[PDB]
Amino acid sequence: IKVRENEPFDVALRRFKRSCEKAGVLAEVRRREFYEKPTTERKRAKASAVK
Amino acid sequence: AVVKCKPTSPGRRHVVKVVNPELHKGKPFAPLLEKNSKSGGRNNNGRITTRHIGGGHKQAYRIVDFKRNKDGIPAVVERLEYDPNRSANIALVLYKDGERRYILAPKGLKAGDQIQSGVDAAIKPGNTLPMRNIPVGSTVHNVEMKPGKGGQLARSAGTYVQIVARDGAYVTLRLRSGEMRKVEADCRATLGEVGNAEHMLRVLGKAGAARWRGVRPTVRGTAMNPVDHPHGGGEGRNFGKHPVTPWGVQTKGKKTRSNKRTDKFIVRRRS
Amino acid sequence: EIDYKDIATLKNYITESGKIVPSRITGTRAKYQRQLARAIKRARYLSLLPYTDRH
Amino acid sequence: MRHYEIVFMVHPDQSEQVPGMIERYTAAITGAEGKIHRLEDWGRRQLAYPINKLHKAHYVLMNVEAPQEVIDELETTFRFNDAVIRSMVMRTKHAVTEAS
Amino acid sequence: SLSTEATAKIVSEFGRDANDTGSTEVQVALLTAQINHLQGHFAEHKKDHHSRRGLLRMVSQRRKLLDYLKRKDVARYTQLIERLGLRR
Amino acid sequence: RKQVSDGVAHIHASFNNTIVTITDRQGNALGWATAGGSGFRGSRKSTPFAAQVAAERCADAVKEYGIKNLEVMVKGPGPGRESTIRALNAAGFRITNITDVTPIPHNGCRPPKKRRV
RNA sequence: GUUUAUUAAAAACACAGCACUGUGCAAACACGAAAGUGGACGUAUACGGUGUGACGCCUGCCCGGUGCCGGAAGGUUAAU
RNA sequence: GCUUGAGUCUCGUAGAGGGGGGUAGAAUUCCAGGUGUAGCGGUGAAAUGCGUAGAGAUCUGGAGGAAUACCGGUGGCGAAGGCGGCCCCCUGGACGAAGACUGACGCUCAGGUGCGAAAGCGUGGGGAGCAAACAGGAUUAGAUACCCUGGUAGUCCACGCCGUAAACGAUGUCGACUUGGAGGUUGUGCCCUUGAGGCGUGGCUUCCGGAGCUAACGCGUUAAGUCGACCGCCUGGGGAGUA
């Protein structure tokens, strides 16, 4: 979660949060408890991941 | 165990009893009994001061130990008994030095059960000890309000008081009312909750049951003439007035606490 | 993997913010990913590892 | 008589009462003719997260074979004792003796 | 299920010898032992509806074997249910 | 006044508004500025521009403290946050740490239903 | 069940049950120039007041008026 | 009588199978307090709502309830409904390896009995979040809706009831035979284990396809192919799964 750097620093370059929290994990927990749509969203996500 | 009576003869149709097989079927312990003469609701002037009281069954008073002074001596619960003067049951207990006393019976307490009053008592239900030694957030009954005086809070059946704070020489207590009250922390209190909760589930069923607990009828105010009650009179049913006591003071809302002496000790009124 | 007290091994199999890493990344055949995760959780109870990096 | 692995943290300020406790606990095991296989005192070790804040605490690993009743009263001993925070007793996984 | 020492004891009591562990009296007695032990378990719990399904498999299977042994040798049947205290 | 010389910039980016609070290392706030309090009410208070002018305006109003070092703590998602920390090192601050402190439940409370728009 | 002893026994009163409200104990409340007493040797699962009146299905909308509860900013406001 | 069906015993394996008890960490809400100050929240835009009685933000302490991120996977277990932190206790089943034992003890099953999501009902608790009803704000021609702000039953626990679902692989159960390929998961045997290998042999499962079947679509060794046993059900649409 943290970053620090010594005096050679210019830019933020914190892409630790395109790794874990920001993009998916908080936008997922904005909306409803189903049990049902996730079983089919994961079903078609794993059925789309195919060659 | 609550039991609906079978509806033979109306009068029994709606009765719910609270039977207890663990109460002592027999005579109470005699040298802790004394005469309790019934008053009728009437003061030393003869006048009815509290209305609706009178008749009912003959009762003998049972000296219940609310103080719990025998500190450090253990006591085994000899039995549980029916007390007519209270909602709760009383446990007759036997100290190790051969002294019997009646205490209010807490919730889990059966016959053959060790209780122990005093500072170094174990924290388990039935043990009376000062509230600077009880943990915060514990259900506690038979609470003293002044140290040494006797228990006066949470005595009626199924009733507890939660200790919520220990700020200094005082403990903040959530009374069963919902009221937050400060009590001095040297005041003893008995652990657990007092134990006949199902008392509130009984339904009495007929008019004579109320009569035999000593509760005379209540004539309602609007059925009277104007000379009797402020509600009075009127050619069929006629209310038209703001509801009052029989002495003209507003019922239905009007707050009647005036103390100013114990307002220091009230952290929050009930709601 | 079988053990949870070896927190060097467990600390390899965890991310920088306390989260268990998927077997899609680290190899780790599924039996040992299950033993692994269950050992990580037993270690987080004992405060050998952290639950997160914002305690 | 089955196997158990007991660990428990101790409050750091009562660290000097640690080996005494150990003895008593081990004594309780020998009250039931159960045997104790390893025993480790891991020292005051830094906690990964604060608990009542209280950082660095004193860990004791035990690994005892015993009947389940003395393990149960050992658990209640860990309940009431204010010294010990976070016990954990586990599975058989038949008797171990090694380090980590 | 049942202890190894318990199963060995029942095989030793009901079989022709040890290693005769599939005979009809032996299977019936092992099922009986487990049925009674789980009477103790299901007096408590009472909402372990999954374990009970295993128990009713034990009851039904015991019943099938008693029916077999009844229509093969009735003397073994009467000695068996006499010894196990079943049939009520 | 009181001359703290190190603080923390808690930026609270949400979808509708970013709110920047500059405090000390004890956690006592020294001065705040929201994107909605900088003009541009409405669809324009959730933009990176509004967040950066919110952060410029929060860099002002803590001149009374002489803050030179600060950590950055970032909550929530939002069109803000990234631009926000940029505005902070466009205001002479030595930006030391950038932590992201978004609250993530470990499957806690049930989130609300919504949005059949 | 009770009631107009002596023209009214009833659909009226009562009632169990329900609800609202007051009451933290030196309780509210009542009798009492006061002391005191009843409430109660009870303690909110208790006690007082008010309405409705077993049980079953239910109890809709209105807070502008009158009351009550709460608020404290401003206006007005006694003795001094 | 016999062992190739069915079952018992020995040793292990994997598992969110069940029931009871305890505990842990994040987060939401509430309460008390510190800093601090003019907005916060919300939306397509707004307003209702909260806020100088000091909100929102932020830090500290506390209470409480529910759910258990990451692992997590057309992964696993269960007859089905379903089951997801960690630990203990009680307990069911499955599968594998070699050997021993019983000896057809088997398959299906009308009536019968049991289990059976969710909502709902009864009694007693609990009540943080979410949220039918409800209220207000908008939107609109209207808006008893979608959207916003609140919000009660309910959701949670104990015991009892109900007895249903697109309770669905829209595919009854049991058994036998019939070309293949790529995986997943869990056992086991053999070989320089010369490593994250090579060769087999089981259990469960996913995708694609051959013959065959099928109205077609598709199914395709887990069949909707080729057969056998027993059960359940169908007979034009509506009326009506109603009286």
Curated annotation (Swiss-Prot), chain C:
Q: Which GO terms describe its cellular component?
A: cytoplasm; cytosol; cytosolic small ribosomal subunit
Q: Which UniProt keywords apply?
A: Acetylation, Ribonucleoprotein, Ribosomal protein, RNA-binding, rRNA-binding
Entry annotated with the keyword Ribonucleoprotein: yes
GO biological process annotations for this chain's record? cytoplasmic translation; translation
Recorded superkingdom = Bacteria
Q: Which GO terms describe its molecular function?
A: mRNA 5'-UTR binding; small ribosomal subunit rRNA binding; structural constituent of ribosome
Instruction: State the family named in the UniProt similarity comment for this chain.
Output: Belongs to the bacterial ribosomal protein bS18 family.
> What role does this protein play?
Binds as a heterodimer with protein bS6 to the central domain of the 16S rRNA, where it helps stabilize the platform of the 30S subunit.
Q: Could you describe the subunit structure of this protein?
A: Part of the 30S ribosomal subunit. Forms a tight heterodimer with protein bS6.
Kindly provide the name given to this protein in its UniProt entry.
Small ribosomal subunit protein bS18
Which part of the complete protein is shown? 20 to 74 of 75
From Swiss-Prot, chain D:
GO MF: mRNA 5'-UTR binding; small ribosomal subunit rRNA binding; structural constituent of ribosome
Keyword Acetylation part of the UniProt annotation: yes
Positions of post-translational N6-acetyllysine modification: K93
Point out the signal peptide segment.
Answer: none
Task: Name the UniProt key words of this record, in alphabetical order.
Answer: Acetylation, Ribonucleoprotein, Ribosomal protein, RNA-binding, rRNA-binding
Q: Which GO terms describe its biological process?
A: cytoplasmic translation
Q: Does the keyword Acetylation apply?
A: yes
PTM statement from Swiss-Prot or TrEMBL:
5 different forms of the protein, varying only in the number of C-terminal glutamate residues, were isolated. The sequence shown is form bS6-6, which is the longest. The first two Glu are encoded by the rpsF gene, the other Glu are added post-translationally by the RimK enzyme.
GO cellular component annotations, sorted alphabetically? cytoplasm; cytosol; cytosolic small ribosomal subunit
Per the similarity annotation, which family is this? Answer: Belongs to the bacterial ribosomal protein bS6 family.
Complex formation: Part of the 30S ribosomal subunit. Interacts weakly with uL2 in one of the 3.5 A resolved structures.
Q: What does this protein do?
A: Binds together with bS18 to 16S ribosomal RNA.
Protein name per the record: Small ribosomal subunit protein bS6
Q: Please name the taxonomic classification of the source.
A: Bacteria, Pseudomonadati, Pseudomonadota, Gammaproteobacteria, Enterobacterales
Which gene carries the instructions for this protein?
rpsF
Counting on the full-length protein, the chain here runs from: 1 to 100 of 135
Curated annotation (Swiss-Prot), chain E:
Q: Which cysteines are joined by disulfide bonds?
A: none
Which Gene Ontology cellular component annotation is one that this UniProt entry carries?
A: cytosol
Mind telling me which InterPro entries this protein's record contains?
Answer: Ribosomal_uS15 (IPR000589), Ribosomal_uS15_bac-type (IPR005290), uS15_NS1_RNA-bd_sf (IPR009068)
Q: Which domain of life is it from?
A: Bacteria
| Classification via CDD domains | Ribosomal_S15p_S13e (cd00353)
Keyword Cell inner membrane in the entry? The reply is: no
- UniProt record, GO biological process: cytoplasmic translation; regulation of translation; ribosomal small subunit assembly; translation
Among Pfam families, the record links this protein to:
Ribosomal_S15
Single annotated GO MF: rRNA binding
Q: What is expression of this protein induced or repressed by? A: Part of the metY operon that extends to pnp, also has its own promoter.
Keywords (alphabetical) are: Ribonucleoprotein, Ribosomal protein, RNA-binding, rRNA-binding, Translation regulation
Record-stated family: Belongs to the universal ribosomal protein uS15 family.
Q: What does this protein do?
A: One of the primary rRNA binding proteins, it binds directly to 16S rRNA where it helps nucleate assembly of the platform of the 30S subunit by binding and bridging several RNA helices of the 16S rRNA. Binds to its own mRNA, stabilizing it 5-UTR and preventing its translation. In the E.coli 70S ribosome it has been modeled to contact the 23S rRNA of the 50S subunit forming part of bridge B4. In the two 3.5 A resolved ribosome structures there are minor differences between side-chain conformations.
The record's note on quaternary structure and interaction partners says: Part of the 30S ribosomal subunit. Forms a bridge to the 50S subunit in the 70S ribosome, contacting the 23S rRNA.
UniProt cross-references to PANTHER family, sorted A to Z:
RIBOSOMAL PROTEIN S15, BACTERIAL AND ORGANELLAR, SMALL RIBOSOMAL SUBUNIT PROTEIN US15M
Name of the protein in its database record:
Small ribosomal subunit protein uS15
Q: Which organism is it from?
A: Escherichia coli (strain K12)
Curated annotation (Swiss-Prot), chain F:
Q: Which GO terms describe its cellular component?
A: cytoplasm; cytosol; cytosolic small ribosomal subunit
Q: Which UniProt keywords apply?
A: Methylation, Ribonucleoprotein, Ribosomal protein, RNA-binding, rRNA-binding
**What is a GO molecular function of this protein?**
structural constituent of ribosome
The answer to whether keyword ATP-binding applies is no
SUPFAM superfamilies in the record, alphabetically?
Answer: Translational machinery components (SSF53137)
Q: Name one GO biological process term.
A: cytoplasmic translation
The intrachain disulfides are none
Q: Which domain of life is it from?
A: Bacteria
The record's annotation in Gene3D superfamilies points to: Ribosomal protein S11
Pfam families found in the cross-reference section? Ribosomal_S11 (PF00411)
- Among its keywords, does the record have RNA-binding? yes
What HAMAP family has UniProt attached to this entry? Ribosomal_uS11
PANTHER family in UniProt = 40S RIBOSOMAL PROTEIN S14/30S RIBOSOMAL PROTEIN S11
Its family remark reads: Belongs to the universal ribosomal protein uS11 family.
Spell out the subunit comment: Part of the 30S ribosomal subunit. Interacts with proteins uS7 and bS18. Cross-links to IF-3. In stalled ribosomes contacts ribosome rescue factor SmrB.
Give the misc comment. Answer: Has been predicted to contact the N-terminal domain of IF-3 based on footprint studies; exactly how IF-3 interacts with the 30S subunit is controversial.
The function of this protein is:
Located on the platform of the 30S subunit, it bridges several disparate RNA helices of the 16S rRNA. Forms part of the Shine-Dalgarno cleft in the 70S ribosome.
Task: Name it.
Answer: Small ribosomal subunit protein uS11
User: What is the originating organism of this protein?
Assistant: Escherichia coli (strain K12)
- Encoded by which gene? rpsK
